[PDB]
């Protein structure tokens, strides 16, 4: 896996297949987390 993509050597990132017709649970969702004096 020394710089060469192949079997058992995968690129670490994968995109989401977001489409308007892709059910409910496969739709894109916007998430904001507000993590907790000024």
């Amino acid at each position, epitope marked *: 896996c*020394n*710089g*060469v*993509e*192949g*079997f058992n*050597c*995968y*690129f670490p990132l*994968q*995109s989401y*297949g977001f*489409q308007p017709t892709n059910g409910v649970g496969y739709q894109p969702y916007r998430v904001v987390v507000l993590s907790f004096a000024t």
Partner: antibody
Amino acid sequence: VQLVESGGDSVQPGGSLRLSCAAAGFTFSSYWMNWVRQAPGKGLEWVANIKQDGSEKYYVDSVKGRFTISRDNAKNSLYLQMNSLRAEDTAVYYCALSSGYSGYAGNYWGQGTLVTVS
Amino acid sequence: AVVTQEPSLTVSPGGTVTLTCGSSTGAVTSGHYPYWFQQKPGQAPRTLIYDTSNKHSWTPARFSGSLLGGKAALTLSGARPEDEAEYYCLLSYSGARGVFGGGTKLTVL
């Protein structure tokens, strides 16, 4: 991951030509090394392969007995020699690196070298 | 050692694509570990799909290395003008002596 292929030139039919490919940016002797050729205006034709350690070689039947592959793991490169080269064998030859499950087909491709026979 | 493809496909921008490939005998399965390549004029062929369905890092995620009814395919979820290219398939057989299909030309309307 770069594959540098050369050796293509204008040659006469009935003769022979040795093509070569050098590896750069990756380990040579960990992957299978492929050869593919494409005649202008045509699709891709499978020509040959060689196993990681050179113990096995594979050819498309159409070049069997004419094409030979050898390699030098200390130079990170391989050579393809084609004997009894036909006038019909005008094509760009490409070097490809196979890191897949079986090693039969390449993932990375070089720029190719043109072989013209006249 | 015979592989066939649909000679050409025309797709409207944003439309889907189904490019197909297969062997004259048996059926295409994961055991053929099918490969798909894309070639633009002046360029070397670039592998998009390897080992049936694995997609490369340089390949747009709009492309999908799916299989059909005993056939290999390369589909698109929405084609773009940038995708105009000749596409090629390669199947394994009894060993590492693969056979390419005739080539399938994809254009965008």
